[PDB]
Design an enzyme around this catalytic site. Structure first.
Site, PDB file in Angstrom:
ATOM      1  N   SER A  48       0.726  -0.967  -0.059  1.00 58.54           N
ATOM      2  CA  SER A  48      -0.120  -0.265  -0.360  1.00 58.54           C
ATOM      3  C   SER A  48       0.996   1.346   0.115  1.00 58.54           C
ATOM      4  O   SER A  48       0.258   1.938  -0.074  1.00 58.54           O
ATOM      5  CB  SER A  48      -1.049  -0.330   0.956  1.00 58.54           C
ATOM      6  OG  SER A  48      -1.821  -0.536   1.339  1.00 58.54           O
ATOM      7  N   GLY A 213       2.585   0.160   4.388  1.00 58.50           N
ATOM      8  CA  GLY A 213       2.125  -0.643   3.259  1.00 58.50           C
ATOM      9  C   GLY A 213       2.163  -2.485   4.053  1.00 58.50           C
ATOM     10  O   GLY A 213       2.864  -2.482   4.522  1.00 58.50           O
TER      11      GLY A 213
END
Length: 269
Positions: A48, A213
């Protein structure tokens, strides 16, 4: 410094050795240009963290008149994938604004929101072209989630140094309008999924904004803009590739690297 480890890198090598896996770190003091690194030029899956670059790509389209913050992007239940709390919550309404989708990717890593933004803007290839235009020849977006969270050669990877430099350009380099730059930093400041990573190591009173992420099976990442009072800001990126280490233990490694960053920044960097 190719023969012997620099002393400033030793704490990062030790964090890595004690926990296993492969730890990439890069930090830069934007005032002095001093840096801290470990595996700073090795590739890691973005996971992410790509969403912090995607949000900037969309805001740059707003700035150029190619997009509007208030435009509604339509979607249905068929578009929903995992870890999409905001788009899932709004699916019955059938749409969310560009502004709300950008906020969802930055604040909650909303997966469907990121796919919808990529659908509006030319997909992974256009995200890659956006960062190339900023001078980043390393970072690349190639696939959509969930497959983009799986190692596959160099697909969907960056290096700690490359993404830190790109984050510096986006947040401090006059590539976004004043309003878009502030909106990017606001979403990163309000971000929730990274609060037990770099930011948990920072001294009380330091202002910070991050983009994390994660993959379930190995990857735990974070990059941050760090604003200590009374000095120039710093950028720091930490990417940890550790198959078989628990998610909680991987976050602990990011906090340890964050503490090593604080020690560096307050004493030599």
């Amino acid at each position: 410094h190719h023969h012997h480890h620099a002393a400033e890198e030793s704490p990062l090598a030790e964090i890595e050795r004690r926990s296993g896996g492969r730890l990439g770190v890069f930090a830069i003091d934007t005032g002095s240009g001093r840096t801290l690194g470990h595996r700073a030029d090795e590739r890691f899956l973005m996971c992410s963290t790509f969403k912090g670059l995607l949000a900037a790509q969309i805001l740059a389209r707003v700035d150029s008149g190619s997009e509007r913050l208030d435009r509604l992007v339509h979607y249905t239940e068929k578009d929903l994938i995992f870890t999409s709390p905001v788009t899932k919550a709004n699916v019955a309404q059938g749409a969310m604004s560009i502004e709300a989708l950008c906020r969802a990717v930055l604040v909650e890593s909303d997966n469907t929101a990121a796919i919808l933004l990529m659908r509006s803007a030319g997909g992974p290839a256009a995200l890659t072209r956006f960062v190339r235009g900023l001078g980043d020849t390393v970072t690349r977006s190639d696939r959509y989630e969930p497959d983009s969270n799986r190692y596959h050669g160099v697909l969907d990877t960056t290096t700690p140094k490359a993404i830190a430099a790109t984050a510096q350009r986006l947040l401090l380099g006059d590539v976004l309008s004043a309003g878009s730059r502030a909106r990017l930093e606001r979403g990163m400041t309000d971000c929730k999924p990274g609060l037990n990573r770099i930011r948990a190591a920072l001294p009380a009173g330091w202002l910070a904004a991050d983009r994390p992420g994660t993959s379930v099976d190995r990857e735990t990442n974070d990059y941050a803009l760090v604003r200590p009072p009374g000095r120039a800001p710093l950028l720091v990126a930490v990417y940890y590739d550790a198959p078989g280490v628990s998610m909680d233990a991987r976050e602990a490694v990011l906090r340890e690297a964050g503490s090593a960053f604080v020690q560096w920044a307050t004493n030599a960097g």
